[PDB]
């Protein structure tokens, strides 16, 4: 009734067939007694990397080893416990006199990858999906708290950007936005995740667009959309100037972290946003150096 | 263990010095669940006409290599029935299966270092002062089956060390060993289907990490060339042809 | 209202405190997610995954970096002569800092547990040799020569058909925990030396290069845990990035 | 009862977090489950073999 | 009283908060709600109305803007000649504008969903035609031709009896979601485009107009589904209203 | 002609997949749309000028006074409902003073 | 008990709040149910026909 | 929100009050504890010696 | 507005008001004004012996 | 690059000295008459 190579067929098996499964890891393993092995035909000592594995060799078959019952705690290293800490991405100004954002208002372009400690610690992974806890501290050039009230607003893609400090946009009557005086603690507010992908990316190889792909366009070489969140806007509450220079630094904490596919580590400076560039003439070594191989 | 045979579509390779398979994070490609796709037309499974051994272009390994790297998706998109469903949909998804071998002597001696760096983004030397915000050209993001050399491998092109590529899928060909890598390679994206134009899932890295070398008299020319198969081929979305 | 009485610590923005913040989406759901291959749950699953170990850290030409990567070994006059030293110290200043092991202490304070390092023989087939590869724990200086470093723990290597060896650096420590070890007085988590000599020679026929290359790769042990996060001691950054 | 839209909704994983919202992503972080799979990037070989075995038979 | 503290956040009016506040008239009862037609529920319930799709979005004279409303079909020479073109993507800028869904649109984020177009034929009872109404998923440029277009997704129309047909834009997306597409890197969320084909011809007999007209009606399918609210790219207002 | 919406569907236009959709459509219910705080007023009390320069001033309740929240309601003939209302208060220059 | 007072008073529709007063209006907005009636503004027909039929018969 | 009215005391840093504090390091595990001689309960222990 | 942060060993060790240290990004931090009340936290016994 | 588009084997020089190449039966007749040049090269099998 049916061809044989369609019903023995396998094509459109869904479930990802998976080799590894992961086990329950509270505590750092423990050590077993180990006794001398004099033997030929096992060598728990030789590997081969070429594989492309990890040497599965283990204390106990290197050296004569003793009993100890490991309790120490592998929490700490959860992805949530590395994450979850608040740090600097965002810094805006709003100065009085001068040539950026003199007019008391500002449009920051929201992209966590302006800062080398948060940048270099997500960019660990390729992918990574989660919610975040942002916290704005607002304050003077000096550090001064001043009584100054403020209005942050969040505008998705596609909204209008305010384009002065009485812009009819600032009426929020849908975007969310978060009245403060520089006076209260540091407002602080919780964000999904959401991107129309199923996580960040931290790498696109790829373009944006089709068609030709031409010098003046490269620009948009590892630029995904997925990423791009909107803008956030900041303004003094008022139809005057401020009567003092303001300075708004971002804060961001990741929570209910997922995250998939580890990369090395950055190992040059970062020079720009947008891309991994790094300075040709400055190729400095991943570490330290010293004289000779054979001196400490 | 040593030898091994793979037998996709209607092509087959044979090796007698390998060093066992490799399955990138432990996962087979697999095709695409009905609760994680989106896209509603049934796609296009053409199975043995595109899920089979292509054979890319052939690279010479000097004693002065640096190495060499390969786009996936794209290394294909030009060749065989693959490029054609890869040209005429819009939506694309496929595992691989990569074959890199190199044969010498007992003689000769160098190591490779194959390996699968996900989302594998090119950087520029910005000028060399580090002022310029310069960017790859096309034929660099995207060399195509001619693949493209590195220039600055200690930092993959990328200002990222090489001595840590190692946590891709990687295998290494170490003469006195063997004489081929085979990496298997699931579907990785955060879609469920992606474009084969745009978008390059993964690029394959092929780098010198023990010159290679041998005594005047030795056969000196020593080849290095890229087996791949696509699997679980899956394209959607059809239109009219399109190169890019 | 209720009667309630604020302590310290009253609006304070601490960095690391887990607390709840007004959402200000209402309703949102998000993106369902697919299945993406290569998840991580924890940071110890990339710690024993073997990375190259920049032994050979002296290079530092621009035309020369790539060869950090892999150490020496040739015909000797065999008398055991040394082939190559380094600390076996994880988060200190050296060999380790080309490591995904290395890098991902950085951000830890303190550690804990067993290190491997395997070594591979990349010669040639018809090359044959033994090495002994000595690990010396604390208080024990650079040995001199190969009769003093073979006291310690240590494994002698054959070349052959299995072309690396795997070194286990055994936790062997008087605190259950070590900081990161740098000069002068922080020495005191220092964990030892590593030193490969000659057991025999490298022997080699005629027609076969005089001179072969190790590369060596290293890695935690499933008894390795870290503690107490801090930020790595270098920030990529010089001036603003833009 | 809650709306569930947190990012490791459908996850599995276990969390035991605290909210005062009906979003549930602006739940704490939380403790989580410690489960690993070290074998996914450290031996991710096809045909595994035993660490007393010459891996190259 | 009760130990508490104050956590960042506090006193911070957001905006999208949803929280108690104090009433201002204690034991008010509302006017009791009466029955009313046409109760909406969901907005996406508005999503599936169809409403007129400006396609013709040429006329901007005084004038002739009720004619964006249609758009002509006539006798040609028989080489499937092009009738109109528009792009598929909702939230764009274009004859979508003109769309309830489109509006909607504005106040969204993301969408997801297939989209609907119904083509009804507004010539005399003796005019007679087919034609052939493409879509082209993403990737696909503008076709040159006939034989090209027919290469996607498409139904060839028959004019009869029944004066509509429905070109159903399948959800053909990478992403589980699509923003709003614009010019340039936006542009990655492009549906595609739409373009109406003769098959054969406008044929009509001696008495009958020799043009008649098509009217295009746009909505969403019950797969729609919209997130993450914003506000419209427009502001119908210049200075203050009175 | 008839005044309803086709109901032709992707299935009987294209050979489709099947697609379990979970996308929600929470965010799009009344409640999602309009509870949002929007700006519906504006007071003055200058020191000096034509406008309220005597302490005081009178409101007329009417939320038709500005285009975003009025737009938003128009889309609707009759809305019921319970409102929040929140009172930004500062000078023109946004200073926050102690009255 | 509290006062019953709210705008969604006798609704077909069931809603999740919380409330620290006793006049209900003052209640959160809340989650509320999910239904739908597309066919009240896309299909109101009299005598419903198919998408298989030929609409004018 | 939930309707508070602080008392006096509010804000005071009262040396002797045992209260609670947000810690600075989540998931923060102590090495463990050994056996150690000599420990101590009460001082009375030493008012004896 | 104050900013104190802990820098545990190994970590860098701020050189100035304008440091790159002060970014956070793991170490952690508070930050108070001198008008707020004192701020106060809770520290774990972080010794590497017992 | 164009041969490797056909049905083909990869050998690999070993051990075992030999390798074997299947030519599998596509044709689309179930039986093959003599290949000659001209009208008969019809029943040809292709080429190695
Ligand atoms: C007053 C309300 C303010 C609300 C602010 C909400 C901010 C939400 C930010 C989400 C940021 C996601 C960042 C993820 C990825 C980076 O943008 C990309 N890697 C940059 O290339
Ligand atoms: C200090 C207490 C202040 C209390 C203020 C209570 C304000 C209550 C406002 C109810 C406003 C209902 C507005 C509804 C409709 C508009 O007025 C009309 N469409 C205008 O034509
Ligand atoms: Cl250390
Ligand atoms: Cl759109
Ligand atoms: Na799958
Ligand atoms: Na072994
Ligand atoms: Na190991
Ligand atoms: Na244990
Ligand atoms: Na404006
Ligand atoms: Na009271
Ligand atoms: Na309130
Ligand atoms: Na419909
Ligand atoms: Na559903
Ligand atoms: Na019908
Ligand atoms: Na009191
Ligand atoms: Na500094």
Request: contains cysteine; proline residues 8%; negative net charge.
């Amino acid at each position: 009734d049916r061809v044989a190579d369609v019903i023995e067929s396998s094509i459109g098996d869904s479930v990802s067939r998976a080799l590894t499964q992961a086990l329950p890891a509270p505590t750092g393993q423990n050590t077993q007694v180990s006794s001398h092995r004099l033997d030929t035909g096992e060598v728990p000592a030789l590997q081969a990397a070429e594989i492309g594995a990890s040497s599965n060799t283990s204390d106990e078959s290197m050296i004569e080893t003793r009993c100890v019952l490991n309790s120490h705690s592998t929490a700490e290293t959860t992805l949530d416990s590395f994450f979850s800490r608040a740090g600097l991405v965002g810094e805006i100004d709003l100065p009085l006199e001068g040539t950026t954002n003199p007019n008391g208002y500002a449009n920051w372009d929201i992209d966590i990858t302006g800062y080398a400690q948060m940048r270099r610690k997500v960019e660990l992974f390729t992918y990574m999906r989660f919610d975040a806890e942002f916290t704005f501290v607002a304050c003077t050039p000096t550090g001064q708290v001043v009584p100054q009230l403020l209005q942050y607003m969040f505008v998705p893609p596609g909204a209008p950007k305010p384009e002065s400090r009485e812009s009819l946009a600032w009426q929020t009557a849908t975007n969310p936005s978060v009245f403060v005086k520089l006076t209260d603690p540091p407002a602080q507010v919780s964000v999904p995740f959401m991107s129309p992908a199923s996580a960040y990316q931290w790498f696109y190889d790829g373009y944006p667009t089709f068609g030709e792909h031409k010098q003046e366009k490269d620009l948009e070489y590892g630029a995904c959309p997925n990423n791009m969140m909107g803008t956030f806007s900041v303004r003094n509450v008022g139809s005057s100037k401020s009567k003092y220079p303001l300075v708004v630094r971002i804060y961001m904490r990741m929570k209910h972290v997922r995250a998939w596919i580890p990369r090395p580590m950055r190992n040059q400076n970062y020079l720009f946003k947008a891309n991994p560039n790094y300075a040709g003439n400055s190729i400095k070594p991943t570490g330290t150096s010293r004289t000779a191989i054979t001196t400490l | 263990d040593r030898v091994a045979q793979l037998t996709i579509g209607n092509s087959t390779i044979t090796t007698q010095e390998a060093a066992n398979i490799i399955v990138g994070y432990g996962e087979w490609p697999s095709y695409c669940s009905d609760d994680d796709a989106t896209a509603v037309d049934k796609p296009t499974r053409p199975d043995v006409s595109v899920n089979r051994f292509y054979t890319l272009d052939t690279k010479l390994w000097e004693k002065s290599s640096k190495g060499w790297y390969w786009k996936f998706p794209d290394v294909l998109t030009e060749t065989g029935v693959f490029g054609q469903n890869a040209q005429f949909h819009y939506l694309y998804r496929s595992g691989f299966c990569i074959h890199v071998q190199c044969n010498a002597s007992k003689f000769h001696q160098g190591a490779l270092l194959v390996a699968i760096l996900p989302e594998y983004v090119i950087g520029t030397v910005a000028g060399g002062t580090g002022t310029e915000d310069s960017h790859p050209p096309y034929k660099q993001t995207q060399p195509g089956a001619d693949g493209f050399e590195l220039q600055h491998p200690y930092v993959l092109d990328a200002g990222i060390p090489i001595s840590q590529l190692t946590v891709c899928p990687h295998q290494w060909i170490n003469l006195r060993t063997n004489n081929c890598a085979t990496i298997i390679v699931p579907y990785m994206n955060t879609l469920p289907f992606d474009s084969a134009l745009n978008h390059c899932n993964f690029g394959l890295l092929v780098v010198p990490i023990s010159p290679l070398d041998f005594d005047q008299g030795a056969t000196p020319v020593i080849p290095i060339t890229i087996t791949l198969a696509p699997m679980c081929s899956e394209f959607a979305g059809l239109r009219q042809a399109v190169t890019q | 209202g209720f009667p309630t009485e604020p302590k310290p610590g009253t609006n304070q923005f601490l960095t690391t405190d887990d607390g709840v913040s007004a959402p200000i989406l209402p309703n949102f759901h998000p993106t369902p997610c697919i299945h993406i291959p290569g998840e991580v749950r924890n940071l110890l699953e990339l710690c024993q995954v073997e990375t190259i170990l920049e032994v050979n850290n002296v290079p530092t030409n621009a035309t020369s970096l790539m060869e950090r990567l892999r150490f020496p070994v040739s015909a000797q006059a065999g008398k055991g002569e040394l082939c190559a030293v380094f600390r076996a110290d994880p988060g200190r200043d050296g060999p380790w800092q080309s490591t995904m092991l290395g890098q991902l202490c950085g951000y830890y304070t303190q550690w804990s547990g067993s290190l491997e390092v395997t070594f591979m023989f990349t010669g040639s087939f018809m090359a044959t040799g033994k090495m002994l590869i000595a690990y010396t724990p604390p208080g024990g200086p650079l040995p001199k020569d190969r009769a003093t470093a073979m006291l310690g723990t240590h494994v002698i290597w054959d070349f052959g058909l299995q072309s690396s060896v795997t070194l286990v650096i055994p936790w062997i420590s008087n605190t259950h925990y070590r900081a990161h070890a740098r000069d002068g007085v922080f020495d005191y988590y220092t964990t030892g030396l590593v030193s490969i000599w000659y057991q025999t020679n490298y022997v080699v026929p005629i027609g076969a290069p005089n001179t072969a290359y190790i590369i060596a790769l290293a890695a935690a042990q499933k008894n390795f845990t870290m503690k107490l996060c801090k930020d790595t001691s270098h920030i990529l950054q010089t001036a603003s990035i833009q | 009862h809650e709306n569930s839209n947190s990012a490791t909704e459908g996850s599995t994983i276990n969390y035991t977090t605290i909210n005062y919202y009906k979003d549930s992503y602006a739940a704490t972080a939380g403790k989580q489950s410690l489960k690993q799979d070290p074998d996914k990037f450290a031996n991710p070989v096809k045909d595994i073999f035993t660490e007393m075995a010459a891996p190259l038979k």
